[PDB]
Amino acid sequence: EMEKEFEQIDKSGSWAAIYQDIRHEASDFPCRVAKLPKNKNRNRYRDVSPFDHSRIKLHQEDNDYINASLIKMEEAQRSYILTQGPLPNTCGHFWEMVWEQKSRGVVMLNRVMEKGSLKCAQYWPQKEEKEMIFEDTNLKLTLISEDIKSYYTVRQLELENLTTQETREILHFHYTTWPDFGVPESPASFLNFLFKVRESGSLSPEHGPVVVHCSAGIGRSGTFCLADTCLLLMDKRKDPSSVDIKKVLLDMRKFRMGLIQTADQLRFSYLAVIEGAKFIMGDSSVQDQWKELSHED
Ligand SMILES: O=C(O)COc1c(-c2nn[nH]n2)sc(-c2cccc(NC3CCN(S(=O)(=O)Cc4ccccc4)CC3)c2)c1Br
């Protein structure tokens, strides 16, 4: 049981050992397409690639490659697409994926610039009056509105297939205070954000998988999905004791490498899930409490 295991690990200060064990047991599948010479400029990080078996394929005869993985959690019955922060030359590909996969929401866990470097291209319009057109994939993107909070922003975007003139509303959930290789300020601020994404309906099975990304698409992105999947599993069975966090993380890693980067991000996952369990099991006060502690106002 997670809570007992958590204290058992904290007591013996063995998170590093526990975390390394996961790395040692993680699935190792080929990433041949990602390593093809022609795709070199489509990858942000040389050592972070999507496995061939679970990679998202763009629907274009030219090059169907994009650094993005479909994490399909069979038992939990929820899917996510984890991808790297789009590059100046892959923003059109990024949105093409969102369209073809019928995604309703996009979760961004990083900032365009962090530690003085560009960890993600400016792939969405910052001003209503200046919409964006991706000529290579023939898509139009317009900012419709945005709700700015203290540590996160929610934007309503309109994505249009210039080819068919069809349009869709895309919700953009932007967590702006989660440091690279770091953890959220507190379980409360993280859960407050997750529940926001959840309440939008973006994770519903009626929609395509939500797109989740940070810079590499595995650290913060992995932490986010692991916590959400664990809470979902627990929610399906209304039994917090039935969830094996490490086991779920390993199953997730069968679809994309390196999910969760530091021992602390893993430790934070336990923290978020344990606290989230309160809501799952009937506590209708914790949500408001998280909102308070988050200081989003
Ligand atoms: O979001 C965050 O918190 C941080 O975001 C990241 C970065 C960032 N910089 N600036 N902003 N964000 S860089 C980065 C990175 C790039 C290249 C290699 C890395 N390290 C590797 C460590 C070992 N593995 S592995 O998957 O364990 C290898 C493996 C594969 C299969 C089976 C067993 C083992 C791959 C990643 C890690 C991450 Br993640």
Q: Output the 3-class SS for 222-278.
A: HHHHHHHHHHHHHHHHCCHHHCCHHHHHHHHCCCCCCCCCCHHHHHHHHHHHHHHHH
**Minimal-distance CA residue to ligand 1 atom 32:** 28
Can you give the resolution of this entry in Å?
2.1
Whether 24 is in the pocket of ligand 1, judged by its Cβ within 6 Å, is: no
What is the distance between the alpha carbons of residues 21 and 43, in angstroms, rounded to a whole number?
27
What is the distance between the alpha carbons of residues 159 and 157, in angstroms, rounded to a whole number?
6
Q: Are the beta carbons of 107 and 194 closer than 8 angstroms?
A: no
| Residue 47 CA to ligand 1 centre (angstroms) | 7
Whether 266 is in the pocket of ligand 1, judged by its Cβ within 6 Å, is: no
What is the distance between the alpha carbons of residues 227 and 188, in angstroms, rounded to a whole number?
13
| Catalytic (active site) residue 214 | yes
Q: What are the backbone angles phi and psi of residue 84, rounded to the nearest 5°?
A: -80, 165
SS3 content of the chain, % helix, strand, coil (to 5): 35, 20, 45
Neighbours of 88 (CB within 10 A): 10
Q: Are the beta carbons of 2 and 276 closer than 8 angstroms?
A: no
What is the distance between the alpha carbons of residues 266 and 55, in angstroms, rounded to a whole number?
24
Neighbours of 98 (CB within 10 A): 23
Quote the strand ranges of 119-202, DSSP E: 132-134, 139-148, 152-161, 166-175
Whether 213 is in the pocket of ligand 1, judged by its Cβ within 6 Å, is: no
| Residue 206 CA to ligand 1 centre (angstroms) | 32
Token code pair at residue 83: 């991808």
Question: CB-side exposure of 62: number of CA atoms within 13 Å?
Answer: 6
Domain residue extents for the chain: 1-297
Q: Which fold has domain 1-297?
A: Protein-Tyrosine Phosphatase; Chain A (3.90.190)
| Residue 257 CA to ligand 1 centre (angstroms) | 8
- 31, 91, 120, 214: the catalytic one is 214
What is the distance between the alpha carbons of residues 209 and 129, in angstroms, rounded to a whole number?
29
Q: Are the beta carbons of 203 and 105 closer than 8 angstroms?
A: yes
Question: CB-side exposure of 248: number of CA atoms within 13 Å?
Answer: 28
H/E stretch holding 199: helix 187-199
Whether 219 is in the pocket of ligand 1, judged by its Cβ within 6 Å, is: yes
